mmCIF file of all heavy atoms in Angstrom:
data_model
loop_
_atom_site.group_PDB
_atom_site.id
_atom_site.type_symbol
_atom_site.label_atom_id
_atom_site.label_comp_id
_atom_site.label_asym_id
_atom_site.label_seq_id
_atom_site.Cartn_x
_atom_site.Cartn_y
_atom_site.Cartn_z
ATOM 1 N N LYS A 21 38.617 164.926 163.979
ATOM 2 C CA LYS A 21 37.501 165.810 163.574
ATOM 3 C C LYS A 21 37.405 165.938 162.058
ATOM 4 O O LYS A 21 38.154 166.674 161.349
ATOM 5 C CB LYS A 21 37.791 167.268 164.155
ATOM 6 C CG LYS A 21 36.744 168.257 164.048
ATOM 7 C CD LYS A 21 37.174 169.514 164.732
ATOM 8 C CE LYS A 21 36.152 170.421 165.125
ATOM 9 N NZ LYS A 21 35.713 170.119 166.516
ATOM 10 N N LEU A 23 35.642 167.146 158.937
ATOM 11 C CA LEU A 23 34.924 168.486 158.781
ATOM 12 C C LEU A 23 33.876 168.532 157.565
ATOM 13 O O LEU A 23 32.935 169.288 157.636
ATOM 14 C CB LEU A 23 36.005 169.571 158.368
ATOM 15 C CG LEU A 23 37.094 169.762 159.473
ATOM 16 C CD1 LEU A 23 38.135 170.695 158.998
ATOM 17 C CD2 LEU A 23 36.437 170.232 160.800
ATOM 18 N N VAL A 31 37.227 166.439 153.851
ATOM 19 C CA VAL A 31 37.907 167.460 154.522
ATOM 20 C C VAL A 31 38.055 167.040 155.951
ATOM 21 O O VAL A 31 37.108 166.720 156.653
ATOM 22 C CB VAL A 31 37.279 168.835 154.430
ATOM 23 C CG1 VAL A 31 38.102 169.974 155.011
ATOM 24 C CG2 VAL A 31 36.776 169.219 153.009
ATOM 25 N N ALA A 44 42.774 172.620 157.676
ATOM 26 C CA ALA A 44 41.840 171.713 157.040
ATOM 27 C C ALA A 44 42.497 171.082 155.961
ATOM 28 O O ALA A 44 42.914 171.795 155.081
ATOM 29 C CB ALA A 44 40.661 172.624 156.626
ATOM 30 N N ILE A 78 39.361 181.786 151.669
ATOM 31 C CA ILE A 78 40.173 180.735 152.333
ATOM 32 C C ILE A 78 41.604 180.688 151.754
ATOM 33 O O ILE A 78 41.819 180.903 150.506
ATOM 34 C CB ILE A 78 39.391 179.454 152.238
ATOM 35 C CG1 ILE A 78 39.925 178.503 153.383
ATOM 36 C CG2 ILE A 78 39.588 178.860 150.862
ATOM 37 C CD1 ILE A 78 39.436 178.848 154.760
ATOM 38 N N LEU A 94 44.589 173.699 153.819
ATOM 39 C CA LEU A 94 43.822 174.954 153.735
ATOM 40 C C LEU A 94 43.750 175.513 155.155
ATOM 41 O O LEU A 94 43.942 174.832 156.154
ATOM 42 C CB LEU A 94 42.454 174.719 153.193
ATOM 43 C CG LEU A 94 42.468 174.384 151.680
ATOM 44 C CD1 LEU A 94 41.350 173.371 151.313
ATOM 45 C CD2 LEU A 94 42.349 175.588 150.811
ATOM 46 N N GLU A 95 43.301 176.880 155.185
ATOM 47 C CA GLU A 95 43.128 177.512 156.371
ATOM 48 C C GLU A 95 41.973 176.752 157.248
ATOM 49 O O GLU A 95 41.045 176.389 156.657
ATOM 50 C CB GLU A 95 42.675 178.935 156.088
ATOM 51 C CG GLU A 95 42.436 179.806 157.349
ATOM 52 C CD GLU A 95 42.096 181.389 156.848
ATOM 53 O OE1 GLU A 95 42.020 181.585 155.601
ATOM 54 O OE2 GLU A 95 41.830 182.171 157.639
ATOM 55 N N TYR A 96 42.167 176.639 158.533
ATOM 56 C CA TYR A 96 41.113 176.147 159.488
ATOM 57 C C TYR A 96 40.243 177.283 159.939
ATOM 58 O O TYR A 96 40.680 178.355 160.332
ATOM 59 C CB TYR A 96 41.740 175.484 160.631
ATOM 60 C CG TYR A 96 40.781 174.988 161.616
ATOM 61 C CD1 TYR A 96 39.782 173.911 161.218
ATOM 62 C CD2 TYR A 96 40.660 175.437 162.977
ATOM 63 C CE1 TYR A 96 38.839 173.520 162.020
ATOM 64 C CE2 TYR A 96 39.715 174.870 163.800
ATOM 65 C CZ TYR A 96 38.782 173.930 163.317
ATOM 66 O OH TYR A 96 37.817 173.391 164.225
ATOM 67 N N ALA A 97 38.966 177.113 159.812
ATOM 68 C CA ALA A 97 37.949 178.092 160.138
ATOM 69 C C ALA A 97 37.132 177.505 161.371
ATOM 70 O O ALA A 97 36.300 176.730 161.191
ATOM 71 C CB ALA A 97 37.079 178.543 159.050
ATOM 72 N N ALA A 98 37.558 177.903 162.567
ATOM 73 C CA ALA A 98 36.995 177.323 163.824
ATOM 74 C C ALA A 98 35.472 177.474 164.023
ATOM 75 O O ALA A 98 34.873 176.660 164.692
ATOM 76 C CB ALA A 98 37.783 177.851 165.010
ATOM 77 N N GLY A 99 34.861 178.543 163.317
ATOM 78 C CA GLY A 99 33.527 178.726 163.502
ATOM 79 C C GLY A 99 32.625 177.815 162.619
ATOM 80 O O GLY A 99 31.386 177.853 162.864
ATOM 81 N N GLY A 100 33.184 177.020 161.681
ATOM 82 C CA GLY A 100 32.373 176.261 160.765
ATOM 83 C C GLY A 100 31.507 177.173 159.763
ATOM 84 O O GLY A 100 31.760 178.356 159.606
ATOM 85 N N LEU A 149 32.411 180.163 155.475
ATOM 86 C CA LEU A 149 32.852 179.726 156.815
ATOM 87 C C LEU A 149 33.102 181.022 157.651
ATOM 88 O O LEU A 149 33.258 182.064 157.207
ATOM 89 C CB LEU A 149 34.116 178.884 156.750
ATOM 90 C CG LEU A 149 34.078 177.640 155.834
ATOM 91 C CD1 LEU A 149 35.295 176.730 156.000
ATOM 92 C CD2 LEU A 149 32.813 176.810 155.994
ATOM 93 N N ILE A 153 32.852 181.446 166.204
ATOM 94 C CA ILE A 153 31.478 181.690 166.577
ATOM 95 C C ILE A 153 31.235 182.483 167.860
ATOM 96 O O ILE A 153 30.378 183.251 168.006
ATOM 97 C CB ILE A 153 30.616 180.376 166.586
ATOM 98 C CG1 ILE A 153 31.411 179.149 167.140
ATOM 99 C CG2 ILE A 153 30.104 180.033 165.169
ATOM 100 C CD1 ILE A 153 30.655 177.953 167.519
ATOM 101 N N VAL A 162 34.906 179.438 150.455
ATOM 102 C CA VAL A 162 35.547 178.235 150.208
ATOM 103 C C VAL A 162 34.963 177.558 149.032
ATOM 104 O O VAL A 162 33.961 178.019 148.472
ATOM 105 C CB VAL A 162 35.578 177.151 151.377
ATOM 106 C CG1 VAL A 162 36.358 177.648 152.613
ATOM 107 C CG2 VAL A 162 34.189 176.678 151.769
HETATM 108 C C1 38O B 1 32.197 173.996 168.046
HETATM 109 N N1 38O B 1 32.638 174.144 166.688
HETATM 110 C C2 38O B 1 31.501 173.973 165.786
HETATM 111 C C3 38O B 1 32.006 174.191 164.337
HETATM 112 N N2 38O B 1 33.046 173.297 163.960
HETATM 113 C C4 38O B 1 33.387 173.114 162.614
HETATM 114 C C5 38O B 1 32.625 172.316 161.810
HETATM 115 C C6 38O B 1 32.873 172.169 160.481
HETATM 116 C C7 38O B 1 33.945 172.793 159.900
HETATM 117 N N3 38O B 1 34.498 172.857 158.647
HETATM 118 C C8 38O B 1 35.638 173.559 158.603
HETATM 119 C C9 38O B 1 36.496 173.819 157.459
HETATM 120 C C10 38O B 1 36.191 173.409 156.157
HETATM 121 N N4 38O B 1 35.002 172.657 155.979
HETATM 122 C C11 38O B 1 36.974 173.850 155.018
HETATM 123 C C12 38O B 1 36.641 173.538 153.695
HETATM 124 F F1 38O B 1 35.580 172.662 153.441
HETATM 125 C C13 38O B 1 37.399 174.039 152.626
HETATM 126 C C14 38O B 1 38.431 174.812 152.797
HETATM 127 C C15 38O B 1 38.790 175.100 154.193
HETATM 128 C C16 38O B 1 38.098 174.593 155.290
HETATM 129 N N5 38O B 1 38.418 174.940 156.480
HETATM 130 C C17 38O B 1 37.670 174.609 157.647
HETATM 131 O O1 38O B 1 38.079 174.935 158.764
HETATM 132 N N6 38O B 1 35.823 174.053 159.863
HETATM 133 C C18 38O B 1 34.779 173.577 160.714
HETATM 134 C C19 38O B 1 34.482 173.732 162.084
HETATM 135 C C20 38O B 1 34.206 173.368 164.953
HETATM 136 C C21 38O B 1 33.658 173.093 166.391
#
Side-chain angles (χ1 to χ4, degrees):
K21 188 179 203 88
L23 301 174
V31 187
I78 201 72
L94 294 144
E95 179 179 1
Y96 180 59
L149 308 185
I153 38 166
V162 299

